[PDB]
């Protein structure tokens with residue numbers, strides 16, 4: 001595979017969004033991966049509605065601001081036959097009744113693919129598919145205060161993940177410890193967090209923070 005990948009340079013990735021004080025990370029991760037695969041199919045990048053997922057994907061297993069899973073979001077889009085755009089169904093950071101309108105649907109998918117639980121498999125998927133939905137352990141103060149460099153937290157768990165994000169690429173940079181590889185991750189905490197809203201997560205360090213443990217993308 002390539003040593004470095006960045007799908008933002010190829011037009012696959014919308015700007016960084018902000019989930020607010022709602023536990024809806026799974027919906028931002030899902031819309032990010034589906035935005036990528038829709039662009040791959042149509043050549044058109046359209047920001048998609050996280051609120052649509054928060055309000056409407058309960059029957060697939062999601063629980064709004066109380067949590068969810070990207071795969072359940074992908075199933076909703078397939079079962080529902082569409083997903084509205086961000087502009088038509090804007091984000092309110094609170095769960096309300098479903099207001100989906102098929103006339104304003106701009107995305108579809110036909111299922112999803114779960115990646116095997118190995119960083120080598122995640123790398124191949126990122127290199128060849130596009131941005132990938134992933135789950136990480138983000139419950140540490142060091143993650144809140146991250147400003148730059150490669151994020152490594154010795155107390156991170158590879159099995160207890162609590163936050164959905166989007167891998168948009170990977171790369172390397174020289175460091176003191178010679179642990180130089182990183183996943184390029186888009187978060188949903190606005191652009192004032194981290195590096196304009198992004199984090200470089202340690203790559204090839206024993207599946208750090210579980211980044212390869214629940215990875216998937218939608219089939220368009």
Ligand SMILES: *[C@@H](C(=O)O)[C@H](O)C(=O)N[C@@H](CC(C)C)C(=O)NCCCCNC(N)=[NH2+]
Pocket residue numbers: 019022023024025026066067068069070134135136161162163164
């Ligand atoms: C994430 C956030 O808003 O920061 C939000 O709390 C969330 O959805 N968390 C998920 C974890 C994923 C990695 C996003 C969560 O804890 N809920 C998942 C419930 C699904 C139940 N089934 C299984 N298999 N866990």
